Amino acid sequence: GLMQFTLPVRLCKEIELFHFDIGPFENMWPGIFVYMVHRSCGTSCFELEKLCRFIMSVKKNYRRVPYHNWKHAVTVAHCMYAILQNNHTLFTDLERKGLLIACLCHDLDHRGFSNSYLQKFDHPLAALYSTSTMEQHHFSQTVSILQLEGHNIFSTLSSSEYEQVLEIIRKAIIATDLALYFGNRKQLEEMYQTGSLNLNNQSHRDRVIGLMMTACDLCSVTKLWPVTKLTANDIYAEFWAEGDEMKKLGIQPIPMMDRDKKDEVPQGQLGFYNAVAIPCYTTLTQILPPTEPLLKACRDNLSQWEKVIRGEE
């Protein structure tokens, strides 16, 4: 009860910043997460014992893949932590509870393959879930782990509050399906600009939490350049393995996934910052001004990819 988590000084200060990197010491990541739940939510949100047992079962259900791994889960939760702490008064008690958990759980049991590869492989998950295949799986794994004995971190919520939090988590996890981000953001753009955006409207809150999920999920582009660049290596290690598997099914993969087209990475990064990242952080900053440092960091990394193309690195 009187048992705070505390971090060393450098981490205690830097964890508050959007560009914080959680570091290479895996054994400190659970403690970093609990620290974020305690300051974001309170020391009373969760029974420590249940929370710790939940976290460890979540870690166990992430796989040893280059990018969609336990470090990604914690990284995406830290970015959510930073958004929530810079917008103290905008979110409900249930939202603060749900969104850090959603982030920790959003890629549970990922195998390093896209929805597209599952559909072309004819994986069982693609018959069970026809759209947002992996994301419906991640939510499914979240509910499974919540139902293990001693893992119900929400046990003190009422029946209707429990239904509300599981519904926040569901929509938040589904929103990490990038295919859905394009329309969600267009709709948010029009609502903000015609001044119809209304945060008392539940369907509007949903869209804004969806955009936060995309922003947190992509947050490798908002780090200091050496973090961004070394994270890109892990991302391509998965993409190129998928490309290899596409070629095993007799299908030329898209160039993003073809290791024979490494030369095209720098131009593919510009497309991605211009088509996905910059628009994401722009609309996020319009709705939630204190998230501006994510947009600034993203623009700094786009300019670093521009230098790569010009052979200045």
Question: Does residue 68 have an active-site annotation?
Answer: yes
Question: For residues 44 and 81, what is the distance between their CA atoms, to the nearest angstrom?
Answer: 17
Residue 94 vs 265, nearer CB to ligand ILS: 265
- Residue of 68, 110, 137, 151 marked catalytic: 68
Of 257, 269, 278, nearest in space to 313 by CA: 269
Tell me if 106 is assigned to a ligand binding site: yes
Binding part of the chain for ligand ILS, among 101-109, 118-126, 194-202, 268-276 by CB under 6 A, reads 268-276
Q: CB under 8 Å to 101, separation ≥6 — which residues?
A: 142, 153, 169
DSSP 273: I
- Tell me phi and psi for residue 32, to 5 degrees: -60, -40
Does 271 contact ligand ILS by CB under 6 A?
Answer: yes
Neighbouring C-beta atoms of residue 184, cutoff 10 Å: 21
Q: CB under 8 Å to 234, separation ≥6 — which residues?
A: 66, 67
Binding part of the chain for ligand ILS, among 127-135, 155-163, 267-275, 304-312 by CB under 6 A, reads 267-275
- Cα torsion for 275, 281, 285, 287, to the nearest 10°? 70
Does 260 contact ligand ILS by CB under 6 A?
Answer: no
Residue 176 vs 301, nearer CB to Mg ion: 176
User: CB of 72: closest distance to Mg ion in angstroms?
Assistant: 9
Residue 153 vs 256, nearer CB to ligand ILS: 256
Tell me if 217 is assigned to a ligand binding site: yes
String marking each residue 215-244 x if it binds ligand ILS according to CB under 6 A: ---x-xx----------x--x---------
Of 220, 239, 292, nearest in space to 74 by CA: 220
Question: For residues 31 and 52, what is the distance between their CA atoms, to the nearest angstrom?
Answer: 9
Tell me if 107 is assigned to a ligand binding site: yes
Amino acid letter, residue 218? L
User: CB of 277: closest distance to ligand ILS in angstroms?
Assistant: 7
Residue 201 vs 252, nearer CB to ligand ILS: 252
Active-site residues: which are they? 68
Query: Binding site for 3',5'-cyclic AMP: what residues are annotated?
Result: 68, 269
